[PDB]
Amino acid sequence: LRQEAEQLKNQIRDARKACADATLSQITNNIDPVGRIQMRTRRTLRGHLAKIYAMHWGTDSRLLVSASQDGKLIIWDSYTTNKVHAIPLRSSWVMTCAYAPSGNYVACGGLDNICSIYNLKRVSRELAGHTGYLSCCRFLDDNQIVTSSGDTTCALWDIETGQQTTTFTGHTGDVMSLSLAPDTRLFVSGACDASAKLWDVREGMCRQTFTGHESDINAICFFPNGNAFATGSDDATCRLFDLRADQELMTYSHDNIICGITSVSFSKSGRLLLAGYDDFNCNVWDALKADRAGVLAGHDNRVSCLGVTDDGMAVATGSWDSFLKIWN
Amino acid sequence: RKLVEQLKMEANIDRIKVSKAAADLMAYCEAHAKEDPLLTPVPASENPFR
Amino acid sequence: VWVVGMGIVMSLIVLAIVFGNVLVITAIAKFERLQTVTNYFITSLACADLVMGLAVVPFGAAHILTKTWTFGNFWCEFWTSIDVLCVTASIETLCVIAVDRYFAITSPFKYQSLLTKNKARVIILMVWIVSGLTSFLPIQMHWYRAQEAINCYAEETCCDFFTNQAYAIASSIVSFYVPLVIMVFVYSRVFQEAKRQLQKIDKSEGRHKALKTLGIIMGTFTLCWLPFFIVNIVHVIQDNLIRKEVYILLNWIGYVNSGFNPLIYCRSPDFRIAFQELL
Amino acid sequence: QRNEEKAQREANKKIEKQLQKDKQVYRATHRLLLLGAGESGKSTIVKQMRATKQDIKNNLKEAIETIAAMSNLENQFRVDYILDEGVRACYERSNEYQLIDCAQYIFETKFQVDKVNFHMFDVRDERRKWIQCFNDVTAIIFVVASSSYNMVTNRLQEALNLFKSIWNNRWLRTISVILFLNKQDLLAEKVLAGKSKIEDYFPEFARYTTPEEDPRVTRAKYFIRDEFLRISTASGDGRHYCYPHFTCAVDTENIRRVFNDCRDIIQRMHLRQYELL
Ligand SMILES: CN[C@@H]1CCc2c(ccc(O)c2O)[C@H]1O
């Protein structure tokens, strides 16, 4: 009966252990360290009503969108530091935000189990097929929008149609973060049941599913090469998995670090992994060397989200203190 | 019952050697590191912020 | 050599008043978190303390220690005007902060709504503006002037002030006496609110320190100024009673209050957070 | 050329002006969260605080579907059409088998502003990660069913287990909790009449005695509060206070009761600051 699945689980684990030939740290040891990295607030972006939960760089990298629990969604111009458009949200609380690759539409999530896409150039559509709060929204094109909800079922909507084109379901715990890859084909979603599985948009089947962590998975993000991704657990440890190897490549954790993790984002070249925390600080660790390189603690409250521009010029970080610091 | 099917789906997967995956990822982080302002800050004139 | 030894103690007092209020004032602008809602008044008191400390206090040490006021007569009068406002500001700022604590506790659900950042600037500026009507007379006007040591005003050596009996009664009231009624009455009603809450919790759960906590706020202010302003009213109506040396001793007792002011003002984790970056 | 920067300044000024206007409104508004257990009847007090007909039929149909009562254990053909003597047994078995609808028969709210505007709203997830997103609410109305010992680990014990989840979260480290002992009359009703004593469900009931209606209900009434108080007693250290005043079946003063408790919630919060008390 279920023993065969358990036997299959043992068979899957055996292949991963057998496929392990050498350790990443052993190979990366000869690599020269990046050295100490110091970042400063080249801009000091602020002026929102309450604590924010989401932040997303625009495709052009000129603009960023941040949504707070106050219900006000405002798109902020980083260069001029002047707010561009402030669109109130119908739902009192919002939990996620997204920006269009074309820049035409801005998407804001919600804890009211309804996802709504706004038109910059007037809410366009409202999507509520999924049950429970929406965790993360991100759409590759103006036609298909990917949202992960608390119903343990992440689905890709059709913006024009307004209905669920496909449903990627069967995940153990509540899905808390969804990350899209530059190739736009496959996307990795992380749930609260420590399971990190990578889906396929067209196939709808979980090609690979990793469960290295022990605690709930908070956020995930891809590398520029699109062949690997990193996830951060509610436990202090954050790991990076190689998709072609289906294993945990390197485990990132400091003995001193004991607080939670709320965001994760690589760099333009991927060498510098910037990881947020609830410890009011963001720590930048070398992806290859697997060692801590530099820390920055400009934020005062818990950091919520962090992202890097498409050009990679500078990083942004959210905060529950309503002050989003644009580090450089 | 779907988990048995789901496990069977992942039962046979084309796997690349972790050593090979590491080396390719290391090169992807090596050759592409040149154009990284975070790795090396550019001039304050070149950087729109400063 | 007694003066030289006395000057060493006087040297520390000027230094203590400098860094004591500046550190609180520096933290108010250094960290944005504590800058917005409260300690905005505490910065005004700290700013008032800095003026009294860095400017008014050291010249007083020069006045007593040296032979006489070597500086000019105009600046001698200017010193009294600047000293009057600084002393009047700290008492008023403490009363304004005293209203802050009372107006919040006694009238919740409206304190957050009624008070505003612009409203805080209006009240804070009003304290300085009200201090203007107390400092306008000694410098711009000449109503401050007193035959008892009348030549002292004319003489360039001694800058000791002899003031009309009319000005002393009114100025002392506007400076310390009037806010004392406000500070005591506001805090007395607050002590009732804290006492009521403690009794309510006792009935709610089967299983005070407030008196000590509220005692230092009112006690330090009273124990540092009351002997002075009692003496100030005394001499204006009874000139033969006061001893000249006694007046100066009580005069420097009240200046130490601005130096010890920060301890009463900002002793909390946020103040401890200020020492975190400066350590 | 340079007019673009000036144009953005006007838009930024307009946005900042509009945001500043809403800043007073947001600060004025008081936010509450109604965390209520299933079958506790939190909607009942919510209705009291604040074409329908086929609403009654739906509850009756849902009750009829649960009256599933035969599965837990002539008219069978009649029962098949719908899917009495059996009703009485089902009502007796309704203690074990869940019956949400009464046998007798992200939602939001804008509570009456009165002194200060208050907009309360609620949010069934076992993980309950949504709770950690809330740290600014002044207080949380935690409606618990007093007559839960008969139901179902007992339902009341499961409800008591919520405090362990609620307070050990540490995300709501500065949020008080208000709980209403709903169905207090119903709780006494089962208690007053001879039935399964709470000692059978809660063993330590016999050892417990009244603190310093019949005493049988009165002693029982305090014990549930005392059990709730004991959990809230430990690890409080201020900023975490449980206001346990009972709530009857019908009490229009319940809305006024919250406001009186709400004032003590803010006042105790301010007294915590400045270390005055
Ligand atoms: C050296 N004595 C000074 C000058 C006179 C004066 C003081 C304090 C409060 C007043 O209202 C005054 O008019 C004292 O600090």
XYZ file of N, CA, C and O in Angstrom, chain C residues 104-105 108-109 111 113 190 194 197 201 204 210 213-214, chain D residues 116 225 241 259 262-264 266-267 270-271 275-277:
112
model
N -2.661 62.778 27.730
C -2.801 61.479 27.084
C -3.532 60.492 27.986
O -4.539 59.896 27.589
N -3.030 60.306 29.209
C -3.606 59.316 30.113
C -5.038 59.682 30.480
O -5.934 58.830 30.462
N -7.678 59.500 26.826
C -7.307 58.648 25.693
C -8.394 58.659 24.633
O -9.463 59.251 24.811
N -8.100 58.010 23.507
C -8.927 57.906 22.306
C -9.057 59.252 21.607
O -9.658 59.319 20.536
N -6.186 61.743 22.391
C -4.806 62.220 22.374
C -4.148 61.994 21.021
O -3.507 62.899 20.477
N -5.660 61.533 18.149
C -6.361 62.304 17.129
C -6.084 63.798 17.270
O -5.789 64.480 16.282
N -3.097 62.404 37.406
C -2.509 61.215 36.797
C -2.320 60.118 37.835
O -2.607 58.943 37.574
N -3.413 56.052 37.589
C -2.558 54.887 37.793
C -3.013 54.075 38.998
O -2.997 52.839 38.962
N -6.104 52.036 38.020
C -5.788 50.876 37.193
C -5.212 49.736 38.023
O -5.575 48.573 37.822
N -6.804 45.920 38.338
C -6.091 44.685 38.033
C -6.079 43.758 39.240
O -6.150 42.531 39.091
N -9.262 41.920 39.250
C -9.387 41.021 38.108
C -8.568 39.751 38.301
O -9.031 38.654 37.970
N 4.606 53.000 41.276
C 4.204 54.205 40.557
C 4.541 55.462 41.347
O 4.946 56.476 40.766
N 8.091 56.139 40.820
C 8.296 56.537 39.433
C 7.823 57.956 39.148
O 8.518 58.695 38.445
N 6.661 58.350 39.670
C 6.178 59.708 39.450
C 6.806 60.689 40.431
O 6.728 61.906 40.229
N -14.917 57.074 19.723
C -13.839 56.947 18.748
C -14.210 55.878 17.732
O -14.650 54.783 18.100
N -13.285 30.615 33.701
C -12.522 31.853 33.697
C -11.163 31.648 34.351
O -10.141 32.107 33.833
N -3.082 41.650 28.491
C -4.104 41.593 29.525
C -5.367 40.960 28.967
O -5.795 41.283 27.855
N -15.993 49.096 24.726
C -15.448 50.450 24.749
C -14.839 50.780 26.106
O -13.766 51.388 26.180
N -11.827 48.876 26.102
C -10.892 49.446 25.136
C -10.132 50.623 25.733
O -8.933 50.791 25.475
N -10.812 51.457 26.522
C -10.136 52.580 27.164
C -9.043 52.095 28.105
O -7.937 52.649 28.122
N -9.331 51.059 28.894
C -8.308 50.494 29.767
C -7.188 49.853 28.957
O -6.050 49.748 29.431
N -5.940 51.045 26.044
C -5.036 52.109 25.619
C -4.344 52.740 26.820
O -3.139 53.017 26.784
N -5.091 52.982 27.901
C -4.517 53.646 29.068
C -3.402 52.814 29.689
O -2.349 53.349 30.055
N -0.318 53.129 27.471
C 0.442 54.358 27.674
C 1.212 54.324 28.988
O 2.368 54.759 29.049
N 0.587 53.816 30.054
C 1.257 53.759 31.350
C 2.481 52.854 31.299
O 3.442 53.051 32.050
N 7.198 54.311 31.954
C 7.378 53.530 33.180
C 6.669 54.168 34.372
O 7.098 54.035 35.521
N 5.568 54.868 34.101
C 4.838 55.527 35.177
C 4.122 54.519 36.067
O 4.080 54.700 37.290
N 3.575 53.457 35.488
C 2.876 52.437 36.263
C 2.830 51.111 35.511
O 2.982 51.065 34.291
